[PDB]
């Protein structure tokens, strides 16, 4: 006797812990916290520029710059009062400002840039994640070397990390990390050129690295909110070119919702994984289509809590459970580790608190939905499923 | 031991799994009885090609409501050994075959009611759990409106599952839906037909909005080659229909190559493809399709009858190749009457088109239909529990 | 250097030519040294398809011109 479950009970467990998955996940006591830490998690929304933002983590990357002192001096923008789980939502522009210490200004020298992505892999393997898609913007790092130079530098560094830890069950692959090129951010008066340059950079890179199992760019995520708002009115032709070659478009909504634009974004751009699509209940038909047609909805509870109040444990309630109840495949992610000062394991544990009702089995569905929404070849996705089909600890 | 598609399969003992990972003999009586009881689901039907000969035709022929103009009984002479024919036959001849019904006797309102309800009882004893029979109301209308035809088609299915499908949880009989297939070349401009066809489908999807009852979901945009460019020319229309909840499929059929697949998967956002037994030779296109998750509909008997594949060793049947990379490809029957083969015949035949088809592959082929079906999220979970009731062993 | 569109239609124009454009602009951005061999432009070559030519035309021209790479055009068998 057994219910449907996400992956066929991984060759079954006893009746004793079948009921264990049924009860709601309360983020209390070591028993609950220890179990999630042992899970082989998977995220799909992580920025490379949102790591080592503060503390000793900043110090290690800062002092590892190839040119010893050229970079701006030490400074750590102070985090708001109780910034992990704050009591007052702050605007997005200020939140992005908490990362001036580590980002465009710092990751200019390959010495520090290699180091910055050097310990990302260490952190991810330490978190137990098997598959991750770290986002990066090589255009933000261009003084003498090309944006292509930076992207090639990042890919090589992960391989060094990926080959150094060539362990774990299977073909001994440990953790696999891919790249998603996130726009150009800096629009110094010529934005249409920048988005054209950025999109074509990925297409060349994707064709450059077509190897079976190694780090490679798998898709782009245009954040089109251009000077004239909708850039897709002109970007429809450009998006067609990159879509045909391959790659996956994972446009994130974020600012100002604009469900009407989401309709335009999901279909015309053929987006495969929406971003912070927090509000979908008021557009009942939109949610049903996204529920029916497979399109992931990436979520970052800590970032959402830091941007919006949501009044955890007494904007409305967090829609994760409601989205899961309807059946749309949503995922829990990390956004910026350093800026939010929260790990992924914190994200999942805090996710339950934002909506009293997350059972111990729902988190499996969250990891389940991450697998289908992952930008990976089907041959490896089955192997990822096999890794998920094990390595989960029975309490 | 490792993971596998359904859940109750893992409940089976190690002895069963030994019978699982092995190629299935279609000629074996035990295997034939196995798939017969298998709770399978199919996607590609045609309604009009249900009954073509035998007691099936006479059952509907005498069921007319006003026989004064019913055409005579010139049942076409099917080629010798028509199941597994001697050598491939042209599509035009294939479509011409079975001319006895279609736009011959379904024009009668009473006669059509019998034809569709008889199809439903052909499903429950065929073991089909879920169906998406494809109908073209515009064809079966001369004086009454096409909307009336679709109204009768939906009502007849509903009444055939109002009482037959008690729906006490696990037994809502076989739940069927409707896909508005594009009508053939009428005498006049086809642009009006395409516009009316989509217009008929869009309003239909928003008229039966409940989930338990049979409802219209889906519409295809495939026909000839001049109309193939015409649909691409009017691709703005396809934007409206699939934003209303109507998933669009494409019957690639002949001369599909890469452009047809490329056009369908992206320009029209097709969630499923018709006969597309050419994805393998393009490699990267097949790789792209697998990642997207677009379903592929392959009906073996029709693929054998029109294209020809010289089963038991036109190239090899792409079934194993499709399941290898992972494109969700399903088995279908095209239209039952013309091919004169039921689901169970198609499933067993697929095993002998090409050496392989292990039982896991057959369940995997079964599961892809559930993945790429046009049912809602709640319905899909309901099927998944219901589908997890296959015959384990003798 | 200057890069030419690929023949032997596979992905037809969209897959084949977009990579060619994407390669050029990436390479042009790679080498800014004015005293070194670098990509300076492209040509279109492969053309003459159905009414979707303008959509391909409006796509190919826009991406390169926004960057500012030079553009040449070859003439096919018929020079109408």
TrEMBL record, chain B:
Zn(2+) binds at residues 44, 46, 220, 251, 334. ATP 2 binds at residues 46, 48, 103, 140, 183, 185, 254, 334-335. GO terms for cellular component: cytosol. Residues 39-387 form the Adenosine deaminase domain. It is an enzyme of class 3 (hydrolase). One of its GO terms (molecular function) is metal ion binding. The keyword Protein biosynthesis does not apply. The keyword Manganese does not apply. Its EC number is 3.5.4.4. Its cofactor is Zn(2+). ATP 4 binds at residues 95, 103, 136, 254, 334-335. ATP 3 binds at residues 46, 136, 140, 254, 334-335. GO terms for biological process: adenosine catabolic process; hypoxanthine salvage; inosine biosynthetic process. Keywords: ATP-binding, Hydrolase, Metal-binding, Nucleotide-binding, Zinc. Belongs to the metallo-dependent hydrolases superfamily. Adenosine and AMP deaminases family. This is adenosine deaminase. The chain holds residues 221 to 629 of 629 of the full protein.
């Amino acid at each position: 006797m057994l219910p449907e479950l996400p992956f066929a009970d991984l060759a079954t467990w006893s009746e004793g812990e079948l009921a264990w998955l049924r009860e709601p996940l309360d983020p209390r006591a070591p028993a609950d916290q220890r179990w999630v830490a042992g899970l082989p998690k998977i995220e799909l929304h992580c920025h490379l520029g949102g790591f080592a933002t503060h503390g000793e983590l900043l110090r290690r990357v800062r002092n590892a710059a190839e040119n010893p002192g050229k970079l701006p001096p030490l400074e750590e923008p102070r985090l708001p009062e109780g910034w992990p789980l704050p009591a007052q939502p702050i605007p997005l522009a200020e939140y992005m400002k908490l990362g001036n210490a580590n980002g465009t200004a710092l990751l200019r020298d390959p010495g520090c840039l290699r180091e910055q992505c050097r310990l990302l892999y260490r952190h991810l393997v330490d978190q137990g994640v098997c598959y991750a898609e770290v986002r990066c913007s090589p255009a933000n790092y261009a003084e003498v070397r090309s944006p292509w130079d930076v992207l090639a530098d990042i890919r090589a560094a992960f391989q060094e990390c990926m080959e150094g830890a060539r362990t774990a069950p299977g073909g001994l692959p440990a953790c696999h990390v891919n790249l998603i090129l996130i726009a150009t951010r800096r629009a110094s008066g010529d934005y249409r050129a920048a988005i054209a340059r950025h999109l074509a950079l990925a297409v060349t890179a994707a064709e450059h690295w077509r190897d079976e199992n190694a780090c490679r760019v798998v898709g782009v995520d245009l954040a089109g909110y251009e000077d004239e708002k909708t850039r897709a009115h002109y970007f429809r032709e450009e998006f067609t070119a990159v879509h045909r070659c391959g790659l996956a478009v994972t446009v994130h909504a974020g600012e100002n919702d604009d469900a009407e634009g989401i309709w335009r974004a999901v279909f015309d751009l053929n987006a495969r994984r929406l971003g912070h699509a927090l509000s979908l209940g008021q557009s009942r038909e939109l949610l049903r289509s996204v529920a029916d047609r497979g399109i992931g909805v990436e979520l970052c509870p800590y970032a959402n809590l830091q941007i919006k109040g949501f009044r955890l444990d007494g904007p409305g309630p967090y829609p994760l459970l409601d989205y899961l109840r309807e059946g749309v495949r949503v995922t829990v992610n990390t956004d910026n580790i350093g800026i939010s000062a929260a790990s992924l394991t914190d994200n999942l544990l805090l996710a339950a608190r934002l909506c009293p009702g997350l059972t111990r089995l729902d988190l499996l569905h969250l990891q389940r939905h991450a697998l289908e929404t992952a930008f990976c070849t089907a041959t490896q996705r089955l192997t990822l499923l096999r890794r998920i089909s094990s390595g989960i600890p029975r309490p």
